[PDB]
Structures are given as structure tokens and as C-alpha cells.
Scaffold this active site. Sequence first.
Site, PDB file in Angstrom:
ATOM      1  N   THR A   1       0.736  -1.301   0.036  1.00 32.20           N
ATOM      2  CA  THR A   1       0.013  -0.035   0.101  1.00 32.20           C
ATOM      3  C   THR A   1       0.885   1.321   0.098  1.00 32.20           C
ATOM      4  OG1 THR A   1      -1.814  -1.197   1.205  1.00 32.20           O
ATOM      5  CG2 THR A   1      -1.757   1.250   1.196  1.00 32.20           C
TER       6      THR A   1
ATOM      7  N   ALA B   1      -4.976  -6.387   5.592  1.00 31.35           N
ATOM      8  CA  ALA B   1      -6.322  -5.872   4.819  1.00 31.35           C
ATOM      9  C   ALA B   1      -7.550  -6.184   5.756  1.00 31.35           C
ATOM     10  CB  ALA B   1      -6.380  -6.764   3.625  1.00 31.35           C
TER      11      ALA B   1
HETATM   12  C1  LIG Z   1       0.001  -2.628   0.365  1.00 34.04           C
HETATM   13  C2  LIG Z   1      -0.625  -3.178  -1.041  1.00 34.04           C
HETATM   14  C3  LIG Z   1       0.918  -3.641   0.764  1.00 34.04           C
HETATM   15  O1  LIG Z   1       1.555  -3.070   2.070  1.00 34.04           O
HETATM   16  C4  LIG Z   1      -1.234  -2.279   1.525  1.00 34.04           C
HETATM   17  O2  LIG Z   1      -0.576  -2.399   2.636  1.00 34.04           O
HETATM   18  C5  LIG Z   1      -2.308  -3.324   1.457  1.00 34.04           C
HETATM   19  C6  LIG Z   1      -3.362  -2.841   2.361  1.00 34.04           C
HETATM   20  C7  LIG Z   1      -4.928  -2.957   1.409  1.00 34.04           C
HETATM   21  C8  LIG Z   1      -5.160  -4.452   1.146  1.00 34.04           C
HETATM   22  C9  LIG Z   1      -5.909  -2.435   2.880  1.00 34.04           C
HETATM   23  N1  LIG Z   1      -1.960  -4.649   2.335  1.00 34.04           N
HETATM   24  C10 LIG Z   1      -2.037  -5.651   1.653  1.00 34.04           C
HETATM   25  O3  LIG Z   1      -2.267  -5.943   0.412  1.00 34.04           O
HETATM   26  C11 LIG Z   1      -1.940  -7.036   2.551  1.00 34.04           C
HETATM   27  C12 LIG Z   1      -0.344  -7.099   2.753  1.00 34.04           C
HETATM   28  C13 LIG Z   1      -0.066  -7.860   3.899  1.00 34.04           C
HETATM   29  C14 LIG Z   1      -0.359  -9.313   3.839  1.00 34.04           C
HETATM   30  C15 LIG Z   1      -0.161 -10.149   4.760  1.00 34.04           C
HETATM   31  C16 LIG Z   1      -0.054  -9.640   6.092  1.00 34.04           C
HETATM   32  C17 LIG Z   1       0.101  -8.320   6.306  1.00 34.04           C
HETATM   33  C18 LIG Z   1      -0.052  -7.466   5.159  1.00 34.04           C
HETATM   34  N2  LIG Z   1      -2.470  -8.119   1.975  1.00 34.04           N
HETATM   35  C19 LIG Z   1      -3.238  -8.869   2.570  1.00 34.04           C
HETATM   36  O4  LIG Z   1      -3.688  -8.842   3.665  1.00 34.04           O
HETATM   37  C20 LIG Z   1      -3.849 -10.092   1.752  1.00 34.04           C
HETATM   38  C21 LIG Z   1      -5.046  -9.528   1.258  1.00 34.04           C
HETATM   39  C22 LIG Z   1      -5.792 -10.529   0.195  1.00 34.04           C
HETATM   40  C23 LIG Z   1      -4.738 -11.121  -0.800  1.00 34.04           C
HETATM   41  C24 LIG Z   1      -6.814  -9.904  -0.541  1.00 34.04           C
HETATM   42  N3  LIG Z   1      -4.334 -10.802   2.529  1.00 34.04           N
HETATM   43  C25 LIG Z   1      -3.167 -12.226   2.883  1.00 34.04           C
HETATM   44  O5  LIG Z   1      -2.143 -12.097   2.392  1.00 34.04           O
HETATM   45  C26 LIG Z   1      -4.187 -13.219   3.560  1.00 34.04           C
HETATM   46  C27 LIG Z   1      -4.255 -12.997   5.071  1.00 34.04           C
HETATM   47  C28 LIG Z   1      -2.864 -12.631   5.771  1.00 34.04           C
HETATM   48  C29 LIG Z   1      -2.993 -13.335   7.145  1.00 34.04           C
HETATM   49  C30 LIG Z   1      -2.736 -12.010   7.796  1.00 34.04           C
HETATM   50  C31 LIG Z   1      -2.989 -12.507   9.134  1.00 34.04           C
HETATM   51  C32 LIG Z   1      -3.399 -13.884   9.601  1.00 34.04           C
HETATM   52  C33 LIG Z   1      -3.322 -14.893   8.707  1.00 34.04           C
HETATM   53  C34 LIG Z   1      -3.350 -14.625   7.378  1.00 34.04           C
HETATM   54  N4  LIG Z   1      -3.339 -14.591   3.151  1.00 34.04           N
HETATM   55  C35 LIG Z   1      -3.439 -15.230   2.275  1.00 34.04           C
HETATM   56  O6  LIG Z   1      -4.309 -15.135   1.463  1.00 34.04           O
HETATM   57  C36 LIG Z   1      -2.312 -16.329   2.093  1.00 34.04           C
HETATM   58  N5  LIG Z   1      -1.914 -16.826   0.693  1.00 34.04           N
HETATM   59  C37 LIG Z   1      -2.502 -15.939  -0.384  1.00 34.04           C
HETATM   60  C38 LIG Z   1      -1.836 -16.456  -1.684  1.00 34.04           C
HETATM   61  O7  LIG Z   1      -2.197 -18.098  -1.837  1.00 34.04           O
HETATM   62  C39 LIG Z   1      -2.012 -18.884  -0.583  1.00 34.04           C
HETATM   63  C40 LIG Z   1      -2.436 -18.404   0.732  1.00 34.04           C
END
Ligand SMILES: *[C@@](C)(CO)[C@](*)(O)[C@H](CC(C)C)NC(=O)[C@H](Cc1ccccc1)NC(=O)[C@H](CC(C)C)NC(=O)[C@H](CCc1ccccc1)NC(=O)CN1CCOCC1
Lengths: 244, 212, 240, 233, 222, 231, 235, 195
Positions: free
Chosen positions: B1, B49
Site C-alpha cells: 500500500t 487488509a
Molecule cells: C500494500 C498493498 C502492501 O502493504 C497495502 O498495505 C495493502 C493494504 C490494503 C489491502 C488494505 N496490504 C495488503 O495487500 C496486505 C499485505 C499484507 C499481507 C499479509 C500480512 C500483512 C500485510 N495483503 C493482505 O492482507 C492480503 C489481502 C488478500 C490477498 C486480499 N491477505 C493475505 O495475504 C491473507 C491473509 C494474511 C493473513 C494475515 C493475518 C493472519 C493470517 C493471514 N493471506 C493469504 O491469502 C495467504 N495466501 C494467499 C496466496 O495464496 C496462498 C495463501
Amino acid sequence: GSRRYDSRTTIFSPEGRLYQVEYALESISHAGTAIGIMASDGIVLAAERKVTSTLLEQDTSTEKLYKLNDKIAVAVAGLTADAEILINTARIHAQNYLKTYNEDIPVEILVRRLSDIKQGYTQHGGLRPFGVSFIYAGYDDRYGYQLYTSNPSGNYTGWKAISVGANTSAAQTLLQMDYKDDMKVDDAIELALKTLSKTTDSSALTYDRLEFATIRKGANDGEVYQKIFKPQEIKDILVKTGIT
Amino acid sequence: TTTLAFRFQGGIIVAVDSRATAGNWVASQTVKKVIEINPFLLGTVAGGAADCQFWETWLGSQCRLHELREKERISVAAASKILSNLVYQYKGAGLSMGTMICGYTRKEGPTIYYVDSDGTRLKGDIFCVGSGQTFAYGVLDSNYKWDLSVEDALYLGKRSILAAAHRDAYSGGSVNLYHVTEDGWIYHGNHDVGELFWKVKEEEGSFNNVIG
Amino acid sequence: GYDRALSIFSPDGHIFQVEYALEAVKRGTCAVGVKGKNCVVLGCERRSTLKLQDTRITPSKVSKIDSHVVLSFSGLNADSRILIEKARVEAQSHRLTLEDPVTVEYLTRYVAGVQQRYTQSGGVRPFGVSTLIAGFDPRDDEPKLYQTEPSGIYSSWSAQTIGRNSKTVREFLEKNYDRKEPPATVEECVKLTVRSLLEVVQTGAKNIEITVVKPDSDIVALSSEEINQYVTQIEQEKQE
Amino acid sequence: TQQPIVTGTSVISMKYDNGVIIAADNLGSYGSLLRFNGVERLIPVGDNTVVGISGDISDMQHIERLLKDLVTENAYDNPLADAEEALEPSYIFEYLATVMYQRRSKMNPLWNAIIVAGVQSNGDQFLRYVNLLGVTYSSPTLATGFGAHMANPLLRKVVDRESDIPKTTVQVAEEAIVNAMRVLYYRDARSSRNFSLAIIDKNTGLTFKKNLQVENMKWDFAKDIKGYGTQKI
Amino acid sequence: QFNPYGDNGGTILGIAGEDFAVLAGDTRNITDYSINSRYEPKVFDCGDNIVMSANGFAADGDALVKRFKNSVKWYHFDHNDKKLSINSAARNIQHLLYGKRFFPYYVHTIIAGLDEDGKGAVYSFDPVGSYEREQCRAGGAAASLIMPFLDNQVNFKNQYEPGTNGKVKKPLKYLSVEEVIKLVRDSFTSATERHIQVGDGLEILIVTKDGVRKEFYELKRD
Amino acid sequence: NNYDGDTVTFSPTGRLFQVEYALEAIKQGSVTVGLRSNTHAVLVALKRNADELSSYQKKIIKCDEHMGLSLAGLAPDARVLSNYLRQQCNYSSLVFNRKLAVERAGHLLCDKAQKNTQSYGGRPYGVGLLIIGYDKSGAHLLEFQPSGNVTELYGTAIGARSQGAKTYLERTLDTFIKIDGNPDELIKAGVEAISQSLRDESLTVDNLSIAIVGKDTPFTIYDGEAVAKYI
Amino acid sequence: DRGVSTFSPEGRLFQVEYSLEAIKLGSTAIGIATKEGVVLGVEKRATSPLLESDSIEKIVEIDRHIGCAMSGLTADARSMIEHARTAAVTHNLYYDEDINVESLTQSVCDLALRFGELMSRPFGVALLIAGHDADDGYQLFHAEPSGTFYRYNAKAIGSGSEGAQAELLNEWHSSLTLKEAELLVLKILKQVMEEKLDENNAQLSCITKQDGFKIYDNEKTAELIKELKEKEAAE
Amino acid sequence: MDIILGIRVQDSVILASSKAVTRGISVLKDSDDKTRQLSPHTLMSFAGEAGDTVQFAEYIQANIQLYSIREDYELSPQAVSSFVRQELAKSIRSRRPYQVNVLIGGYDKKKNKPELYQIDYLGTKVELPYGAHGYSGFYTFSLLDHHYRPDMTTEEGLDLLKLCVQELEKRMPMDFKGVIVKIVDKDGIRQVDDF
Ligand SMILES: *[C@@](C)(CO)[C@](*)(O)[C@H](CC(C)C)NC(=O)[C@H](Cc1ccccc1)NC(=O)[C@H](CC(C)C)NC(=O)[C@H](CCc1ccccc1)NC(=O)CN1CCOCC1
Ligand SMILES: [Mg+2]
């Protein structure tokens, strides 16, 4: 169930009085009289022991006057067993304050907390109140010498001179008559004993039927001393004022 | 982000990207990173997210309960502190949240609060939060003045996100603009970087590093 | 834990324990609240059957809840301490979370809520206390005066009195207080408050307490001589 | 958090035209030590269900007690306990599957792989799998442990999809199961020659076969095998 | 040490039309290099014209679907048989997932149906509850293979109008149910070719105002 | 007299007066009728209103796709008990993948009501229930009383003037029991049964409440213009 | 004494029946439902002229689409309103939608019987809950301390309830406009009130789909009072 | 959070606290006031773990303010510092301790003396003529050992403090964006706006 046997200790009368508090005060009115008198340079605590027996060990006895800390003492009127429960709580509370702030507890704070405990027993828990009235005599560097009283209702007030227990009506009239603001400790000692001597239900006031204590700044330079009078010391002070 | 919000003469500008990643996998290009708490309050989201979304959606419910109970809109300070006190309870549990509570009230005026998942809460005029915050700072700081017009301020906020969207691999998709005034927040559209970059390059003459 | 439902309904639809708590308030020493154009004044009776008192250390009738709000009361003295403590804690808790001191209405609402909770909680009796809460909201110059009672109902008052012989002093205030034109100054407001207490008190010596609250955390308690001057002035004008 | 101690190996099973067959050897291994040889790992529930269990034997015995207790509990205040309101294979399975998942969710699993084979009241074949993780799946052929790697390939040559089930008789199906058990004895280092086999048919009911042995084995060719490459003697 | 999670493979796909929506998913269930079942459905009709799939760790997937199905049941009891809208279902699912934020359901969830204006809707969820409405979403093992193809064919990304010097984009338009099913089948056959955990069979659930229809297609079994 | 202060006290003749007073609350409640054949089970309930400006109190509650009840007495108590049944039916589905037997449903209600009649502090439930359902052993009708006593019946009725409908069903027993594969005729028999409990008032469109469950019929409730057919 | 959750020989809970007597002593509250909206009005009833009547809050917002008026021991209503507001906002959080007026009322009424030997006694206050939702439209509910709630086209609670209810019986019809309903509440309130009705001792409110729940100003109500008097004198 | 200093002179206590708030490779703020007024004549500066610092400071502030209202009386700096120490002493054996170091500068009105207390996150209290937390001490203590005199004025104390800040600005690796200086004396607490 058990509802049948509940006295309901914490309820109001139709007149808006707390039955148990009123009846606890009636109990206290039969207890030995205790008097507190506050002077400009110290405080006096005097108390009459309840109908003494000749075979009672007088010197190693404590019924009326108790020490809470080095600066604060209390005179008891009512159930002794109840008073001791509250006294140990008050002693602990004083040490908690000292532990926390590295300063001796202000007299009022200790009085308030002890009075709050009594209040609790009148509003909740379904238990009987403590059948005890205290006279607090103490010193701190904020207000100096202070006299307070608390009763089973948990209401406390400050005084220049006050009595609790038996014959307080007669005792308070006599104190109100002879007390004055520029009074000394030695004068207050005399007033305390003269008052007990007239209000007593006994034939004549003697050393063996009394407990006595003073809180002076009579120690060496800017420090307070608590003196719980010994039997022989009460005997001497009773002769010195011309009662015996 | 990448998210930013700055204070200026004509209120507050808020600008965010729309990318969501799972490692190097670009999961979404259309995520809404501005949460509309009420007509006078906005919240930016960066980090986890679900954490951001769930808890800022929860924040809006707490702000609604405030104005029901108190018959008055919640202050920006009080709103931000509800969120900061919440995340502080979860400190050490692993919440990942980088948020900015932006809004206007009568007593405060335009106000921005930075709040993050390790309990930091800061009032300030300019903040950039996210993986591409430094890229946004570079453009924003070097062009920022208090006396910017509403038109120029909106553009600078948009241009700062674009800058980060370009350089930061974990930022992009599209730019969402907002303008907060005394009358409340005003949405200023979704701007796809796919078209916006070339439009900005041509008109501004910038991005000479890229093959035109 | 002690569970007994002490506060309950009677056939005629009354909660006697709440109504008997009001009797305790009626027994208590009189307290009066009068709000002027730019101030609020809290007057309080102190019974004169207690001589040899130490007025330095004796708990004052008016209590500060925060630097900008005060609370006086009528009824059981021990009960009032519990409400005041709770109110003081809530005042600090509000500053901590909202980053702004309580409004007078909010603080009243909290205290009133506590009083209500004790009317339908098991094992407890209602508070034998009615309060007068007065002050000024943060960054506001409009005077606030509220009343609470054991049942838990609360309301705002231009001027109000509670305690023993309060129906007499309320009668006085009802004809002497003008809504269209409240006491314009501090002196006018204090005088009206002292006048109202003089209908009931007995003597204007060490029986009347007066506390004046003004905007921006400006609270001060009047001394004996200061109050005595109002008593002396009123009596001379009375003989006419 | 557990580690399995005394363990049971493969449980194999398949559907045929009128019902289901299930089998499992009678061994209770203690690591590499083939400790216990009289262990029954097929447990009938009523006259219409057989639960085959692999993995930890202490946890298997716990599950036995639960199923035994389930029959008792179902009989309470139930006049139709031996008729319409009797325990179905699907009821027994869902119960176990609920327990298995609840235990994994408390990080204290029953260290097992379970196959519930039976015939429903309407005549339909029931065959479903559940394990320590609470993972469930159904198929014409099901097997655990080494069975999954070696038995399933052989059993799927007989019943490769749903449409092959009506075409498969009990004679053909049993022959494939008995063959699979032999292959497992050749190749699984924690298997035994002795095993039990159960057939639940919608017509003939429950047939429980004990003390079976792997037979018709090919070992003669071993005499010709000399050395590991060169050696001629 | 005991590992409470597992990977059951498979992949799912949701596409939304103008007055319909599809939710497809392969029927293969696996662990490591073994096939558990060639036909184990993981796309479910949950009532109120909502179809759901929770791909990833099957035990958690089944638990979630089971709980949401139960959530729909109690929504009827508590709110006078009111129909649970797709947007309300999505928010409810967020709370189911985030409820286990500190011991998550290891699944990528997708639901599909019709919004309150009668238009096709697809919502997708991460394991801990972050959700988003989209026209298009692939989830699971082969999501990385299928998703960019959908961007190109459903949302017409990187496609410009011929002869316009890359200045005019290909205009967005809704696809017919016939065209969508073609894209689903081609997506899954392509995924089956290049991903080992995808194959055996394809099951598609189509959602229109009339109800929920099913379609099944064979996939390669290697 | 002296033995009706609470539920924990027996009278000298061995009676529980608080339980009997709870039973009295049912008699004050509006009439409701239950009856079944071999294929279907039907609930018919006369709803009651506060006045002409008010709505009519809903008497029938759904517990599952195959089970539900009608109430007579304290409605909030019916809500508590019906909610308990919903959970027990639901527990049976999630854990055992098994529709709860109507007989077990009764046993569970009996045991829940009983605990309230033996302990200090609590009170008996002040409502009677008629539970209908279709399970693996066909159609069923139960009568729940807050004493704990549950009874399986072909037909019955509870509430004010329920004796009229109960006598009718006792005469009609041989007729309505054989109404198999015909919902509308079984309802008609129930509507005619409840009509024997009417005084001065008659069955109107927003007054009558009917529910039915059967072989290929989920538990469904009919109110408003949907019951105009049966008047 | 006797148990809190005890049944009378007639089959009623003593405490619930006694709480109903407390509600009869309370100030009058009237609610009227129409197709253009629902109107809620109350008698403030200041105990003394020095009491600032604008601080008397007997009409209350639960959500933007649900309002509430009370009568009886009004202090008891605070925790009921708090629960209602939380229930309303909580449902919006879980389901991203407005909550049904009936569902809200049911949630409030679940508290009612949670008393015994939970709270020590029933509530001594009745509530008129008015609102709007997409399914059942404009609704008015009367929530009692018995745990029971009835929907009403129009309803009066408080000291002048039986007299006002009889008046509402005659005056209400299904084609009432909002303006007609407003005047009707004022008319009936003025009839049952002890003191003379004006903008200071009586308060009006309404809930419409478009503008949501709104408490009327004293200036707006004053004009409706003046409009009411003129119309009665006009024939 | 990094640099907090304290110097007790003849008639006052002077607290200097750095303005920078950094996270990662970004200075998020350069005007941060790392202090709270506990009472009219008592000031507490703080430094340590993010979030913990302000949460702890405000919690103490609330408790002291509560005491002031209850007793209508100001606690002595010694009493306040003892209360703060006990809270940190409890904290260190909690599930999650407050990682906060503080300096408490106050003016005792009864003694007519300034007092400076240094308390670390473990609950280690010491009264000092001059104090510091973190890496600051490694430069400032030796500097003050040399230049400090007990009878100095407030103006002399500010010059002495300028000498510390200059040394820190010269030899410290991180940019701490200057300091906010506050003086505590008989007339209460006031901030030096130009430093
Ligand atoms: C920028 C883009 C990066 O920092 C922003 O900060 C965005 C914020 C927006 C979305 C509000 N952040 C993200 O995109 C964020 C980065 C991130 C990931 C994981 C931990 C912390 C920060 N992404 C996510 O949260 C993604 C969003 C999905 C893809 C829509 N989610 C995941 O990665 C999930 C949940 C992670 C998680 C957090 C806490 C406890 C357990 C899990 N994980 C997955 O989907 C796992 N993975 C995806 C690929 O396929 C195999 C499984
Ligand atoms: Mg990028």
C-alpha cells in the site's frame, strides 16, 4: 428456600432510616464512654473501662485505646471483637499508603477508607453492620492535630472535642461548657478526666477503670510522640488533678 | 500500500492507491482503502487488509453509538483514540495496521491523526503510510506549501500516489481522491494508473526515466 | 453472593425502598442551587446542634468532581461519598478516552445511572441521596444546574432545592426567580441563594455554606465573614 | 500435541453393486517392533456399519468406547431403536467427524485415520473417510496409510468411477480386496499376514470374517536372484 | 510436532453476468501426491440464492460452509423469514472468518448470487475475512494460472480498439451465460494441463432469479 | 394457601401449587388445536388481539424444516422453549446429520421444564405447547404441559374452551386419522374442530392461523389471505 | 415476604402485574402510524415551573430509522434504550443493513423477563417503538415489561391511556396523512393532559423513510398547536 | 522516542526531550512533546517502546489528577515518583510489561526545593542533580560531571543544557530534530519556545 430466615439488614424503614444502623447505635450507647479532646499542642484520648472486676489483669490489657500507626490512634466504643477486625484493616491500609507513596498516611484518608468499609455493610452484602464507634486522634503535616469520629452508618465528622458511647449527651454539654480554642494539652487532660468523673455510672472514678493516651509534639524538635498511659501513670495523673 | 493525507489552507486532501498483494502475487487492483466513517470523518487503511477493514468498520459503529448517546458528532481526536486504545489491547498479538483518521469538526477544525498497530497515535499536518510511503513523501514534501489551492492540492495528492505506484512494486492499481472541508468530505474520483501515468507524463513532461 | 431483591414493586405500583430512600433525602440538611446569567451558586445548610466541631477537617458539603464541575447533596452522608468517588473516577476516565472533560449533563447522566442501577440490582438498597450537580461545559459560558434522585431520574433546573424544608425554599424561589431575567451578576445570585436559605436555616452564622462556580474552572468557596456580610445586608433591608 | 505409540497400518475398502467391503490387518506395531498380533481394527456398530481405524491404538480403543456408548445412548427412550430410529452409517460418521475436528481444533487430536463403511436404511452404499485433521472425503474406493498408495490403484482398476459400481459383484470386489492385502504384505514393513474382512450387503446384511491369511504368494523367483549386480553365485 | 493444517488442493472460479452469476470448482480432492477423491463437491447451495465455496484446507472449508449455512437458517428464525441479501451474507462471512483471526480457517472463500437490484454478484474473501465485490475471481491452487486469463477475457484488460493507436480501450460489456461457461471450461482445462492438483471433474453452479442450476463436465484424470 | 409461596414446596396432599398456577395461565390463553393423519400433521390456532387497533398475537412457531409448535399461555416462555427446541433440532443436524425425532423433542422439553419445578429461585414455565412434526416414523403430535408431562396424541386442544374442540376430535377420531395424501381436507377438519371452541366470535381472515407438516411438505405457516380458503 | 418470580392463583406473575400499575401512573405517550410516516408524541409533565422542560427527554432515537417514546418509571428505560441502540448498530455491523423494527422490539422485550432470584425486578416502564423498514414499512410497537409486544396502528400509554385509546379508536383510518396524524396526537394529548397543552410541556416527533427519525422543535410544534386550535374553532 | 534529559539547579528542574518520532526509515514527526503534566508543580518526561510510552504517561497523569481532586491537595514530587516506581515495579513482572523509562521533575512547595527523579522500566528509582535515559547519558553525564554546579541559576542551567544538546547533535548517529525544553519551579511549569 432461605428467604424465610433473612432479616434484611440493609433496608430502609418507612421513615427513611436504616434499622440495623440505628440499633447498632443503641448498642454503642451502653458501651463505656470514650472522650477525645484536641488542643493546640496535642490531643487527649480518655476512655472508661466497662465495669471492671478486681481480678482483671489491668496492666497487660487493651480494651478501648488502640494504635493504628506512629501518628494515629483510636478510642473504641462498642463490640471489641468488631473493632479489632476494623483496626487490623486500618493498620494494613496505613502501611499500603506508606509503601506506595513513602509518606505516612494523612489522617482523613485513613478515616474515610475505614468509614467507607462501614458504609458498605449498610448498603450491600446482607450482613449486620459493625457495632463500633471510633474516635480517631492523629497528626499529619497538612492539617496538624485532628479529631474524628465514625459510627456504624459509615458517616464521619471532625471535632475539637467529642465523646462516644454512654452518656454522650451529658458529656458533650460539659465539654461544650469548659472547652476553649487556646487550650493546652495539660488542660485538656484535666477536662477529659473531669468530664468522665461526672458522667460515669460508677460510684467513683479510679485508675483501674480507665485507659488514657496523649498525642503530643512533646518529643525532641518537630516530631510526634504517642503515649499510651500505664496504670501507675494514670494513678499519678488522677491524683495530680485532684479527683482521688 | 501507499496512502497519504495532508492539511492545507482549504482543508484536508486524502489520497490512496488500490492494490492488494499476497507476497509478490497481485491479488487485487480495485481495493477501497478509504473507509467512509461518516459525512465528516474518513479513515485510511494500510497493512493487513482484514485487520484494517474489520476494525475501521468496527470504528464506524463505535462513532455512531457516540452520536446516539451524546447527541453530537464524535471528535476526530476521540475517534482516533478509540481505535488506538483498541489496537493497544491487542499489542503483541500480531495486528498489522497503519491508519490515518482524517476529518473536520467545529471545535478542532481540520485534523489528521496517524494511528498504527503498535499503539502509536500522532496528530499532524502531513502523513504518508504504507510500503510506498517514502516515494510519496519525496514528491509531496518537495512540492508542499500551506497556501496551495484546492485544485493544486488535489493534484499533488494524486501525483504523490502515482509516484509511489510507479516505483513501489507493492503499490498501484488506481488513485482514490478525497477532499475534506468544513461541510464534510467530497469524493474526487477513481483514477486508473494505466491511463493516468501516460496522461501525466505527456502533460507534465515528467517520468523521463521511462521509455516514452 | 447476597442476591435478595430488596427493591421491588408493591400492589399499588410503588417501589417502597426507592420511596423510603426519598424520605432519607427529606431528613437530610437543606441544599440549594441557583444559576445566574454567568454563574451558578450552590448553597448548603449545616445543622447547628453540632458545636465543638472542627470546620477545617470536617467533610465539606460541596464536592469538586472535576476542576469545572461540583456536586452537593442531601440525604445520607456516607452514601454520598460512594457516588462522588465514582463520579470523580468517571471524570478522569472521560478525559483519558475522549481527550476532553465531561459535560455537566454527561456527569449527571452517569451519576443518575448509578443511582438507577441500585434500584434494580439484587442484594443492594437504593442510595438515600439526591444530588445537585452544577458547572460549565468545556469552552462554554452557559451555566448548567442539574438534579438527581434515588430513583435515577435527572433533569435541568434554573434553580432548585433539596433536603429538609426544601418545599418552603422552593416556594420562595418559584416567585423570586425570574426566567426572563436571571441574576445578572455573582453578587445578585449569591444574595438570592442566601435569602432562600434564610427562610429555613435559623441563624446566618456558621450554618450556611456558599460555593460559587464560574466559567473556565473558576470555583471558590466563601468564608464565614463573606457570607455574614450578605446575612447582615438582607436583614437590614427586611426591616421595612 | 501427541505422538502415536502403538499403531495400526492400512485400512482398505470399496463399494460394490449391493454394498461395501472393508478390511484391515490384525497388527499393533510399536515402532519397528511388531508388538501385538491379536488386534481387531474393524469395529461393527449395529448390523449395518463397520468402522475401520488406523493410527494410534489407544485412541482407537477410546473411539471403540464412544461407539459402544453411542449405541447405548440411542437405545434410551427409543422404541424404534432396532428399526426406523436405528443408528445409520451417516449418523455414526458425522459424529466421529465432529469429534475428530473438535479435537484437532483443541490441538489435541485423536491420532487416527478412520473409514466408516456401511449400508443406509434406503439401501444406498455408505463409504466415507475422516482423519486426525477432521478432513473428510468419499469415493468408490477408500484407503489409509500405505493402502492409499498401493491398494487404491488396484481397487480403482475395478471401480474407476460411479457407473462401475452396479457392474461390480461381491465376488469380484472381495477378490480385489484380498489381492490388495497381499500386495500390502509384500511391501508394507508394518503389516501382518493375518487380517479381518467385513462385508455389509443390503440383502445378506453384515458378514464379519476373522482370522484370514494372505495366501497364493509368489516367492519362488527369489532363488534365482544373486548378489546386487555382478556376482554369479 | 502436530500440524493442524493441511492442503487439499483444488481450485475455484466465480464470474458475474448481468442477470446471473456462476461459481465453478473442480471436484478433485488431494493430499500431497495422492488423490483422495475424483468427485468431492466443494461448491454448495446455501439457500437464498447464494452459492458458496471455501477452497484450501477442506476440514476448515467444510466447517465454514457448515457454519454459514447455519447462519442463514438462524437469520430466517430471528428476522421473520427475511431473505439474506448477498451483501449481508458477505459481511456475515467476514465476521465468521475474523472470529478466528488468531487461529484462522485456511481457505479462500468465494460466494456468488444476485444483488438486490437483480444483478450478478461475486464476493471473495481472504482467510481472515477481508472481502471485496468483483466481476471476476479465481481462488485456490491454480488461481495464479486462471486469474490473469480472466482479467484479459472478462474485463478486457490490455485490449485496445484496433487502429486507434492504443488510445481507445476495448469497451466493457456483460457476457452471456453461454460465453461465461466457455471461459470457465477453457480456464479449467488449461489449469488441469499445467497444475497437478487440478483435474478429474468440473462442477459449475449457475445462479439466476429462477434458482440454482448445476452443470458437470469431465476433466483429465492424470 | 401456605404451600404456594414457591415451586420447591409440596402441599400436605402432595400438590405443587406454583405448577398448578402455571397450568392456570394456559387455560386463560387463546385456544389452539392439533391433529394428524398418517401422512400429515396440522396445527390450527385462534390468535388473540388487544383491541381493534392492535395486531393479532402470533401463536405458531417453526422449530425446523420438519417440526414446529403452537403456544397457549405466556408467549415469552414459548419463545424460550421454542428457541431451545431449535437448538436441539440443530445440534442433531450438525453433529449426527440426523433430523431430531419428535419423541426426543418432547423428552427434551419435559426435562427442561422439570428442572424449573424442583429448584429454589426459579419458576415453572407458564405456557402449554402443541408440537407437530414428520420424522422417520411418520407424522406426530405432542402435547406439552409445564408440569413436565408430555403426551403423544392423534389429536388434542389446549387453551380457553378447549374442551369443545377436544370432544369433537374424540368423536371424529376415526374420520380424520385416515385423511392421507390430502392436506386441505385435514386442515378443514382442524378448522371445524377449533370452531367448537368459539363463543360470540367467528373465524376471520386475520384471526385464524394454520400450520402444516407432512411427507413431502416442510413445516409452513399460513396467515392472512392464505387462510381465506378455509373460512 | 414472597418470591419475585411467583405466579398468582389466576396465572399471572405478581411483579409483572404490579409494574403495569406503575406505568399507569406515568405521563401520557401517544403513537400513530400512517403510510406517510409514524408520529410519536408525549406529555412532558414538569413537576415544578423552575424545571427546564427542554431537558425532559421522553422521546429518544434508537437508530436513524427507529424512534422510541416512553411512559412510567423513565429511569428504567435508559438501559433498555442502550440495549436497543447497541442491538441496532451491532446488526448493521454484522449484516451491513438496517435492522427490522420488529426484530429490534423483540431484542428489547427479551430483557423484560430476565429478572428474578439477571436483574432484581421487572422494568417499570412501557415503550412505544416506532420505525420503518423495507419489508413491512411503517410500524408502531408497544413493548411491555411482561416481555410481550403488540403492533399497533395507533396506541396510547400512560395515565390518560384508556381515554385516549378510545379516542384513537374512532379517529384512526388507513388513509391518514402525516399532517393529520400530527394534529391528532396534539388534539388527544390536550384532552387527557392535566395542565394546558403548549410547546413547552408537550413534544412531537416522527419517523419517515426519507428524512429518518426527527424530534420536532418547540417552534415547529407551536405552529401545529396554533393550526390545531384554529381548525377546531372553524366548525 | 530517544533523548530525554533532566537537570536540577538551585531553584528549578529543567527537562529537555527530543522532538523526533521515527518509524523505519521515516521521521513521521519532528514536533513531538514527550512529556505530561502530572500536577501543577510536577512534570514527567518519557521514552521507550512505541505506544507503551504515552499509554503509561497518561495512565499515571489520570491517577495523580484523580488524587488531586479527591484530597484537594497536590502530591509531593517524592510521593508521585514513589507511586510511579511501584507501577513500573508491578509492570515488570506482568504478562506484558510497560517498556517505558521516565524522568520526573518537580518543585516541592513544602520544602521549597526542586527535585529530579530518574526511573527506568524495571522500577529503578534514583534522585539526581542531573539525569538521562538511553544512549544520551553516555555523553551528557561526563559533560555534566565537569560543568555542573549545584548553586546554578535557571539561565545557567539552560546554557548547560544547550551544551549537552550541541554535543548530542555532534556525536549521536540519529537525527532527533532538536528538543522541547520545559522548566519546573515555584511558579509551576512553563515551556521555552525558542531553543
Ligand atoms: C500494500 C498493498 C502492501 O502493504 C497495502 O498495505 C495493502 C493494504 C490494503 C489491502 C488494505 N496490504 C495488503 O495487500 C496486505 C499485505 C499484507 C499481507 C499479509 C500480512 C500483512 C500485510 N495483503 C493482505 O492482507 C492480503 C489481502 C488478500 C490477498 C486480499 N491477505 C493475505 O495475504 C491473507 C491473509 C494474511 C493473513 C494475515 C493475518 C493472519 C493470517 C493471514 N493471506 C493469504 O491469502 C495467504 N495466501 C494467499 C496466496 O495464496 C496462498 C495463501
Ligand atoms: Mg508499482
